[PDB]
Amino acid sequence: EIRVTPLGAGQDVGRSCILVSIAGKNVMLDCGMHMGFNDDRRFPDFSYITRLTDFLDCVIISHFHLDHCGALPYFSEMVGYDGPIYMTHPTQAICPILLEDYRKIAVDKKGEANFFTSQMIKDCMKKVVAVHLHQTVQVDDELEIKAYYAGHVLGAAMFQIKVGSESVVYTGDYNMTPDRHLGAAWIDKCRPNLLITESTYATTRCRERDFLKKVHETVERGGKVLIPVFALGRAQELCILLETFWERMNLKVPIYFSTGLTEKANHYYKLFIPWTNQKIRFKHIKAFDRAFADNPGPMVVFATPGMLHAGQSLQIFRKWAGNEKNMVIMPGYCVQGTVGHKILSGQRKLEMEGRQVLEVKMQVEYMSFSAHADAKGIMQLVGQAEPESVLLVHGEAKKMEFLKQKIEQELRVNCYMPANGETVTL
């Protein structure tokens, strides 16, 4: 039989550590994380599976998002797992630059108590067997894995896990919208026993045009723009918008960029071309310096800490403010503790050290550039795979209720949406 326990994320986004037991093999299907929490709740509970080396055949990391790989250098080298971790080739490279940024958020969020070091990040990356797409990898004599093209971010794969004839495919964070970037998800008729989807957009070009219109409006009336991004997340998607629209209507006003852990978008684009073009089966954007934002006139800057975590982004956002021509675009969730949640929640009086209330009079806009499958795409992936049962391990339970109702209504299949720790049996 197949017993699946969502160890951290079965009915919430964050701490994705779904665990699958098939005929004799236990596999860990992510090692998620949670921003917000700062003490041992940021990570999944690894006390419900005890040694791990002798017990866990595989660890599988879907994509490079920090809620699917955040605990991986903690689970491997603090908890004590010595085995194979299976990331697609792009994910293995983006992940040690995404996770060396959480170590910075945590280092200054004073939350480095039970936490992974940089050396531990390198050691966890050295335990990775990076697979290619559509390649069947043998981990035992009878258990094999096979990555697919999910089309969500640069490195998203839909891993199939199979012993004999019984199998389960974890489609962690796919997409079904072919846009001006990474395309849609493809899975063939594996026809497995279980399909462990994601359900973030359960009840689900306008953003493409509106992003460029809203930066175009405030670089021509002398205002300035800040986009708070992570290191190699969704910034590289917005860079090609700010080059393609700026071929059309240049205005030749500056566009900066700043990470410190990578180049602007070239190591991303060494991997983007073969991944997007083969594996399905710039002069405008420049560099940024810490003093390069005091220059007057219009400007567009991408900042290093996402979500307005305290860093480059906080300083730049704090410094544009007071000018109503200036503007900031939020493309991400901005968790509770962050300044981003404070400004896209509705507040315009924010506090800092001492009593310095900041009169935020910037324009504030939020265009969610997250590429997940909506309602129709999830059932189209289920139709592609044609499974025997569907599992929902991402998204809120209120929408997952309706997705359960629909995916049980039209497609006559059994859908389970377990909470954290619940074990479902097939």
């Binding site: 986004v13 994380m33 921003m35 917000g36 929490f37 700062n38 006390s47 419900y48 002798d54 998002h65 809620d67 010595d82 085995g83 630059i97 060396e100 280092v107 200054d108 969020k109 004073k110 939350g111 940089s118 390198k122 990356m125 050295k126 335990k127 035992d140 004599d141 964070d173 973030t200 700043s258 990470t259 410190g260 852990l261 990578t262 180049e263 070239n266 190591h267 810490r290 996402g306 860093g311 480059q312 969730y333 968790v335 509770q336 503790g337 896209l344 929640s345 509705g346 507040q347 506090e351 800092m352 050290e353 939020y366 997250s370 809120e396 909470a419 954290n420 720790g421 619940e422 074990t423």
Partner: protein
């Protein structure tokens, strides 16, 4: 917070609001757990009567979400952790009604695992005083924990078990709670169901390892026949919880001074448990000195013998032979656990006095040779171990770790030669996995430093190791070039001054391959090659203009790990006093602090401030501090974007006219708490929960 608290108490139960954030609620619970320690909880509940209104609405309104229900239950438990607040929370029958039928236990929201795991935590927060014991006993609040012991959620079951343990261990401080609990435990240890037996063993394990007192002795005496009757069941029920119970009973000698039948329960258990669980129990028995040596010898002879079906079948009972030959899975598991348990038992003082060091090294070398070929079979058992265990990555990792940890035991040089002659064969094997190569490099490194001059016959191992090291530095995978550079770094840190490590390393082409890796595509292989060629050039084995290549990597490189590694290399070049950074002390720090200052990285700037610390410790002159740092980069760094970089500057300046105006200690007190402190505060949390401006959780 206290001004906004009635507003949030109105918001939480308000059905017109959207669902509150389940992180906001748990941070409120953390805040309330923090505040109800230094203040009397009944004083707090008196001064802000909106909280009892929230709890009464929880009793009254039937349509709250699961998050606020769990929040209110755990909040009631947090407040009612004292007796006076318990009776104050019963003036309107809140606590009997919150946790009884009128609360969430008697409605549909009990189906949510969040509400059940909040009910358990509220009870565990309140069950801390005799009034709580009376409330638990009379109203049936222990029968519900008996039911929830077998809940579907592993988070609720493992909390109901520890709630039962806590209720038992506080009632015994035969009371009705402490007697009904152990009546259920005794009934469950005689049950025919594996989950109930597992729950009873998981209660007894905790309550025997937690408290040592006469009533635990009476519990052990009255339950050891029931425990011992589990070993006559086919199959054995809950073998690992059974083993945990035995090793927590036996670790306290106050239960062996009871009826002796503990040591005869262990003695049969080492002979009747399945092959998966004789190992953990045997190791736990050998980890403690309280067991009899008659038991200890049988405990160790059931640990060794998986490594004795190999020694008796290769070098030219069935209870292990049937395990080592059943499948690659069974053989791999048995040998991995055996070598892991011997890794655990190796460095202890509790090990047996005749520790079979030579035979264990022979068995480990034999297992390794079985994995990477050339292990001759002395029988048909050897002929099945040669084909079953060939090309097995996991047993190779376990055997290499064990052979690494056999280094600590002192022995003759024949053991060192026998270990190295298979570690090298694992290194130069074409089929050796990258992880196996990491294990083999670490094991070789452990086995080389344990050879006390670096010893005879070791230089002839260096001249045969380096032609493998060079081929490993050109490996297709970055893991193996990284591992080879780490091995060269950690071997040129120990014998970098030895004659036969400077005569025999430069006689290879390792330094000219450790230099060609500074241009490797992977940032990890550039970083571990910068640290390689700092350790290679700290001892004079460069095989000149390394400083300009390193400064080029610090200036114009397009990654972070190379620049972090380069600033680290200058950090130990200036600590150590390397000739490149000690021929002109001022000019080097000057030309490196412009590279450090303008970075887009925080650990590089932090290493620059560490380098300024090194320069200032070298100096103590003040004109030398008038260069691009030590008074200027620090002043900019005080207002840096990053708290660790800012704190590194404040700690540096604490260690001139502009230095007087800077309030250093207040700056440090600001730069010692979180960067989230203005938003993890109670007031900011209340405002974030009360924010109605608006504009769904997603992926980070």
């Amino acid at each position: 917070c206290a001004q906004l608290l009635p507003a949030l108490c109105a918001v939480l139960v308000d059905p017109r609001q959207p669902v509150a954030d389940d992180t906001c609620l748990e941070k409120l619970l953390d805040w309330f757990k923090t505040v109800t320690e230094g203040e009397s909880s009944v004083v707090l509940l008196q001064e802000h009567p909106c909280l009892v209104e929230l709890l009464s609405h929880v009793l009254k309104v039937q349509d709250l979400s699961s998050g606020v229900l769990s929040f209110s239950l755990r909040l009631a438990g947090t407040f009612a952790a004292q007796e006076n607040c318990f009776q104050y929370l019963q003036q309107g029958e809140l606590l009997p009604g919150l946790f009884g039928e009128p609360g969430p236990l008697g409605r549909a929201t009990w189906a949510v695992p969040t509400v059940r795991s909040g009910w358990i935590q509220g009870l565990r927060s309140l069950a801390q005083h005799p009034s709580a014991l009376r409330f638990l006993a009379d109203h049936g609040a222990v029968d519900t924990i008996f039911s929830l012991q077998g809940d579907s959620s592993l988070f609720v079951a493992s909390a109901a078990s520890q709630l039962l343990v806590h209720v038992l261990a506080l009632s015994m401080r035969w009371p009705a709670c402490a007697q009904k609990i152990m009546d259920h435990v005794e009934e469950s240890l005689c049950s025919a169901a594996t989950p109930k037996v597992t729950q009873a063993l998981n209660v007894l394990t905790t309550t025997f390892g937690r408290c040592q007192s006469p009533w635990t002795e009476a519990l052990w005496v009255r339950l050891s026949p029931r425990v011992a009757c589990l070993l006559e069941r086919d199959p054995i029920p809950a073998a690992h919880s059974f083993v945990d119970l035995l090793l927590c009973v036996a670790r306290s000698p106050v239960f062996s001074s009871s009826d002796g039948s503990l040591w005869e329960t262990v003695a049969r258990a080492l002979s009747c448990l399945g092959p998966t669980h004789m190992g953990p129990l045997a190791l736990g028995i050998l980890k403690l000195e309280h067991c009899p040596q008659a038991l200890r010898t049988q405990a160790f002879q059931v640990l060794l013998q998986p490594l004795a079906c190999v020694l008796k079948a290769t070098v030219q009972d069935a209870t292990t032979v049937d395990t080592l030959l059943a499948s690659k899975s069974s053989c791999a598991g048995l040998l991995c656990r055996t070598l892991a348990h011997l890794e655990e038992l190796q460095p202890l003082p509790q090990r047996p006095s005749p520790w079979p060091q030579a035979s264990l090294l022979g068995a480990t070398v034999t297992v390794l040779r079985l994995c990477d070929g050339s292990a001759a079979p002395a029988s048909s058992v050897g002929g099945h171990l040669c084909g079953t265990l060939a090309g097995c990555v996991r047993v190779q990792r376990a055997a290499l770790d064990f052979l690494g940890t056999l280094s600590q035991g002192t022995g003759p040089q024949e053991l060192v030669t026998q270990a190295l002659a298979v570690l090298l064969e694992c290194l130069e094997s074409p089929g050796s996995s990258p992880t196996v190569l990491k294990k083999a490099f670490q094991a070789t490194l452990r086995w080389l430093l344990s050879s006390p001059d670096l010893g005879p016959l070791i230089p002839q191992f260096l001249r045969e190791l380096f032609p493998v090291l060079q081929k490993r530095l050109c490996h297709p995978c970055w893991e193996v070039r990284d591992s080879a550079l780490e091995f060269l770094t950690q071997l040129s840190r120990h014998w970098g001054g030895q004659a036969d490590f400077r005569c025999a390393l430069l006689a290879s082409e390792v330094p000219q391959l450790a230099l060609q890796l500074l241009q490797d595509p992977e940032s990890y292989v550039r970083a571990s090659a910068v640290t390689a060629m700092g350790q290679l050039s700290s001892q004079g084995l460069h095989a000149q203009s390394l400083f300009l290549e390193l400064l080029h990597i610090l200036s114009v490189d397009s990654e972070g790990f190379p620049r972090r590694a380069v600033m680290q290399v200058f950090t130990e070049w200036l600590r150590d006093g390397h000739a490149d950074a000690a021929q002109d002390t001022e000019q080097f720090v000057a030309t490196v602090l412009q590279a450090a200052s303008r970075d887009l990285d925080w650990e590089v700037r932090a290493q620059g401030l560490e380098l300024a610390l090194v320069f200032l410790g070298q100096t103590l002159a003040l004109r030398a501090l008038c260069h691009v740092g030590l008074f200027d980069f620090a002043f900019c760094a005080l207002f840096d974007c990053d708290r660790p970089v800012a704190q590194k500057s404040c700690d540096l300046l604490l260690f001139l006219a502009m230095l007087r105006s800077l309030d250093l200690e207040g700056l440090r007190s600001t730069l010692a708490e979180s960067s989230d402190h203005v938003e993890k505060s109670p007031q900011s949390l209340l405002q974030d929960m009360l924010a109605t401006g608006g504009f769904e959780a997603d992926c980070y």
